[PDB]
C-alpha cells in the first residue's frame, strides 16, 4: 500500500526534444519507485536513445501513454504541479522541490492522483500549459547559468518525493 | 564574510572515478555548473576528452575545459580536508553512511571551517572498490528503490550538488 501510493504520481513530459531525456526521466522515476510516464507529443519516441538512457527502466517506456495534448495527459488527475524552463515573475508563486514533495504526498491521500509536469528542454511550458498547473515548481539553481537537464530535473523532484515518503514511514 | 560565504562552492571537488560513458562526464559537468560548483576531477576516465561529453555539457563546457585528469583516486584527493563517497544501501562499519541531506550538512560544516571537500562518485554500476571507499571519511547513499537502486551517474551528481546548494542557501538565510 505504501509503494502503491507512488504508482499514482503521473510524470508528464511535454513535447520532449531529445529522446535520451525521455529514457533518463524513465530511469530517474524507476530509481525512486515511480512508474507512470505520459508523453505529450514527444519529438522522437520510441527511439534507441530513450532505451539506452533508460538503462533497465524499459518497462516504464513500454507502459508509457503517448497523447496529443496536455489536457488528455491530465485527465483524471486530482492536482497538477508544473516545472518549466521559462517561468517569469508575473502570475504565480513557486514551490521549491521539498514543498512540492509535501504537496504531492498530501494530494495522494484518499486515492488521489498527482501529475508532475515537465516542459520542453529550452522552451519550457507555454502560457496555456502553465494555466493547467495549480502549482508551479522551481529548482533553486545558479541564476547566472543554464536550466537543469530535463532528466536531472525529474530526478530532483522524484528524489524529494521519495525522501518525504520514507520520512512518513519513519525510514 | 559575505565574501567568504559567496565563494565556498569553489572548494568542493567533484571526483568521477573511472567513468565509462563520456556523456555522463558532460552531464555531471552540467549538473555541477547549475548548482554553482566548478572543480571537476576525473580518475581514469575511459573516453576524455570526447564529443559526447561536450554534447551533454550544455552551458558547462568551461567545466570540461578546466577538468583535471589523474591516474589515481589518491592524486584526485590531494589537499582535501574531507572526502565523501557514494555507496550502496549497506553501511561499511565503522564508516558513517549518510543520506544526501546529511552529506550536504557535513560539506557545509567543512566549508565553513575553510576546508576542502571532495565528493567522489563511482563507476556506472560497479560503484567504488573497497580500497577507494577506504579513502573516504564518509559514505553517502541516495535512497532509491532496492530493486532498481543505481542512479545514472550525472543524475547522482545532480542530487548531491542540489542538496549542497540547498544547505549553502539556508546557511545564508536565502
Nearest to A27 among B59, B152, B169 (CB): B152
Three-state DSSP at B127 gives strand
Q: Are the C-beta atoms of residues A38 and A14 closer than 8 Å to each other?
A: no
* Resolution of the PDB structure in angstroms: 1.7
How far apart CA A106 and CA A73 sit, in angstroms, is 21
Which among B40, B13, B34, B38 has a CA at the least distance from the CA of B162? B34
Q: Check if B153 contacts A (Cβ < 8 Å).
A: no
| A10: phi then psi, degrees, rounded to nearest 5 | -95, 120
**3-state helix, strand and coil shares in percent for chain A, rounded to the nearest 5:** 45, 20, 40
How far apart CA B79 and CA B112 sit, in angstroms, is 16
Q: Are the C-beta atoms of residues A94 and A130 closer than 8 Å to each other?
A: no
CA distances, B65 to each of A145, B32, B60, B76 (Å): 17, 14, 9, 17
Residue matched to cell numbers 532505451: A51
Q: B12: part of which helix (H) or strand (E)?
A: strand B12-17
How far apart CA A7 and CA B112 sit, in angstroms, is 41
Q: Are the C-beta atoms of residues B130 and B136 closer than 8 Å to each other?
A: no
Q: What CATH number is given for A4-171 in this structure?
A: 3.40.1280.10
| Residue ranges of domains in chain A | 4-171
Cβ contact, residue pair A145, B59, below 8 Å: yes
Nearest to A156 among B59, B154, B162 (CB): B162
How far apart CA A95 and CA A133 sit, in angstroms, is 12
Q: Are the C-beta atoms of residues A155 and B39 closer than 8 Å to each other?
A: no
Q: Check if B61 contacts A (Cβ < 8 Å).
A: no
- State the best of A4, A138, A141, A158 to mutate against chain B, taking most chain B CBs within 10 Å: A141
Q: Are the C-beta atoms of residues B132 and B90 closer than 8 Å to each other?
A: no
Q: In CATH, what is the architecture of B7-174? A: 3-Layer(aba) Sandwich (3.40)
Which among B98, B126, B118 has a CA at the least distance from the CA of B18? B126
Cβ contact, residue pair B31, A148, below 8 Å: yes
| A119: phi then psi, degrees, rounded to nearest 5 | -80, 180
Q: Check if B70 contacts A (Cβ < 8 Å).
A: no
Q: What angle do CA B79, B27, B76 make, to 5 degrees?
A: 15
| B82: phi then psi, degrees, rounded to nearest 5 | -145, 145
**Closest-approach residue (CA) in chain A for B27:** A149
Cell matching residue B36: 554553482
Q: Determined by which method?
A: X-ray
Which among B25, B16, B21, B15 has a CA at the least distance from the CA of B117? B15
Q: Are the C-beta atoms of residues B38 and B63 closer than 8 Å to each other?
A: yes
**Closest-approach residue (CA) in chain B for A57:** B148
Smallest Cα distance from A40 to chain B, Å: 23
Cell matching residue B80: 582535501
Q: How would you classify residue A104: left for phi > 0, otherwise alpha for psi between -120 and 50, otherwise beta?
A: alpha
Nearest to B30 among A30, A31, A149 (CB): A149
Cβ contact, residue pair A152, B149, below 8 Å: no
Smallest Cα distance from A107 to chain B, Å: 22
Amino acid at each position: 500500500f505504501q509503494s502503491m501510493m507512488l504508482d499514482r504520481i503521473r510524470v508528464v513530459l511535454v513535447n520532449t526534444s531529445h529522446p535520451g531525456n525521455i529514457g533518463g526521466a524513465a530511469r530517474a522515476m524507476k530509481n525512486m519507485g515511480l512508474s507512470q510516464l505520459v508523453l505529450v507529443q514527444p519529438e522522437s519516441f520510441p527511439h534507441g536513445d530513450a532505451v539506452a538512457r533508460a538503462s533497465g527502466a524499459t518497462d516504464i517506456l513500454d507502459a508509457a501513454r503517448v497523447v496529443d495534448t496536455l489536457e488528455e495527459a491530465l485527465s483524471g488527475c486530482s492536482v497538477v504541479l508544473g516545472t518549466s524552463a521559462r517561468d517569469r515573475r508575473i502570475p504565480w508563486p513557486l514551490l521549491d522541490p521539498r514543498e512540492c514533495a509535501t504537496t504531492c504526498l498530501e494530494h495522494l491521500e484518499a486515492n488521489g492522483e498527482v501529475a508532475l509536469v515537465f516542459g520542453r528542454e529550452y522552451a519550457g511550458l507555454t502560457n496555456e500549459e502553465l494555466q493547467r498547473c495549480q502549482f508551479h515548481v522551481h529548482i533553486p539553481s545558479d541564476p547566472e547559468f543554464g536550466s537543469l537537464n530535463l532528466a536531472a530535473a525529474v530526478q530532483v523532484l522524484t528524489y524529494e518525493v521519495r525522501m518525504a515518503w520514507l520520512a512518513a514511514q519513519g525510514k
